[PDB]
């Protein structure tokens, strides 16, 4: 059993902390159950959280493995081995300029904004904003609500893909949480262990995650998507519930 889980609004609280998750998290670890972050966040953001590989960054664009991963894959990053699944950021940004020319109105993302602007926009510290701006694959977009429809069409027209992270739209090519989860499972040292996967998430960018797992759980704020399971309370308390009620019993 491997647990794949979103961070913001799933495992992390309203200020990116943990909440009751410590309880549940420490429990899974004690039982030897691998927990794998699958997030829209960047590697720098994941590192600042103290999280260790394997983890999946930027909506599936990068899959990070420990340096000594028993299954040889990806390229060395000094401490890691990286499996790049998506186009690099610079290519997404270039292609975004063409979407913008097509749309005939500004299309702004994180790459266009100062760390100060991103911090003000998100409520983050200046430092956290710099880490969110250090993107390798995926662009976070800051779109006008009424321009969204025209913008998404322009993205499609120029060969980009889009998703929604909970507050912001994202643009990328080849980044998909489920594709990254499938790749990691296929690279797992213990095939029997990987044969059963759990997925927890809260946003549109997590539908690909739910479809790639065997047991899917929605701890988001609204109604569960097609056929996925639910919890009494959202976020980290929904996470704790899922572990106690859905997971532990399946460990027999």
Judge whether 214 is annotated as a binding position: no
248: exposed, middle or buried (C-beta count within 10 Å: 0-12, 13-18, 19+)?
middle
Grouping H, G, I as helix, E, B as strand and the rest as coil, residue 198 is strand
Q: What is the contact mask toward its own copies in residues 104 to 143, using x (rule: CB under 8 A)?
A: -xx-x--xxxx-xx--xx--------------------x-
- Work out which of 205, 220, 228, 237 binds ligand VN3, going by CB under 6 A: 205
- Work out which of 24, 41, 237, 239 binds ligand VN3, going by CB under 6 A: 41
Judge whether 206 is annotated as a binding position: yes
Peptide bond before 111: cis, by omega within 30 degrees of 0? no
Q: Quote the CA–CA distance of 215 and 231 in Å, as a whole number.
A: 13
Stretch that binds ligand VN3, among 36-44, 71-79, 119-127, 221-229 (CB under 6 A): 36-44
The reply to whether 221 sits near its own copies by the rule CB under 8 A is no
Q: Identify whether 6 is a catalytic site residue.
A: yes
Least CB distance to its own copies at residue 115 (A): 10
- Work out which of 97, 195, 221, 245 binds its own copies, going by CB under 8 A: 97
Least CB distance to ligand VN3 at residue 133 (A): 16
- Work out which of 7, 103, 152, 228 binds ligand VN3, going by CB under 6 A: 7
In the bound state with Mg ion, the residue whose beta carbon lies nearer, of 20 and 166, is 166
Closest by CA to 6, choosing from 193, 232, 189, 242, is 242
Contact 56, 64 (CB under 8 A): yes
Closest by CA to 243, choosing from 231, 226, 252, 225, is 231
Grouping H, G, I as helix, E, B as strand and the rest as coil, residue 221 is coil
User: Please, which residues bridge with residue 198 across strands?
Assistant: 3, 215
Least CB distance to its own copies at residue 180 (A): 29
Contact 209, 60 (CB under 8 A): no
Least CB distance to Mg ion at residue 10 (A): 5
Q: Quote the CA–CA distance of 88 and 173 in Å, as a whole number.
A: 9
The reply to whether 149 sits near its own copies by the rule CB under 8 A is no
Contact 166, 141 (CB under 8 A): no
Contact residues: ligand VN3, CB under 6 A: 6-9, 39-41, 165-166, 205
């Amino acid at each position: 059993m491997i647990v794949f889980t979103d961070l913001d609004g799933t495992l992390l609280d309203e200020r990116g902390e943990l909440g009751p998750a410590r309880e549940a998290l420490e429990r899974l670890r004690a039982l030897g159950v691998p927990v794998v972050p699958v997030t829209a966040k960047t590697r720098k953001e994941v590192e600042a959280l103290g999280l260790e590989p394997p983890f999946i960054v930027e909506n599936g664009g990068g899959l990070y493995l420990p340096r000594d991963w028993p299954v040889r894959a990806g390229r060395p990053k000094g401490g890691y081995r990286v499996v790049s699944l998506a186009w690099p950021y610079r290519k997404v940004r270039a292609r975004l300029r063409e979407a913008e020319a097509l749309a005939g109105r500004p299309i702004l993302g994180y790459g266009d904004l100062t760390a100060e602007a991103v911090a003000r926009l998100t409520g983050l510290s200046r430092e956290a904003a710099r880490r969110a701006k250090a993107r390798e694959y995926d662009e976070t977009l800051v779109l006008c609500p009424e321009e969204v429809e025209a913008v998404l069409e322009a993205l499609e027209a120029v060969g980009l893909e889009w998703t929604h992270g909970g507050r912001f739209y994202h643009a990328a090519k080849g980044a998909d949480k489920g594709r990254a989860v499938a790749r990691l499972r296929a690279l797992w040292p213990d095939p029997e262990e990987a044969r059963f996967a759990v997925g927890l998430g809260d946003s549109l960018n997590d539908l690909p995650l739910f479809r790639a797992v065997d047991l899917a759980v929605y701890v988001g704020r609204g109604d569960p998507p097609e056929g996925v399971l639910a919890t009494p309370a959202p976020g980290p308390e929904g996470f704790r519930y899922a572990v106690e009620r859905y997971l532990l019993p399946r460990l027999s």
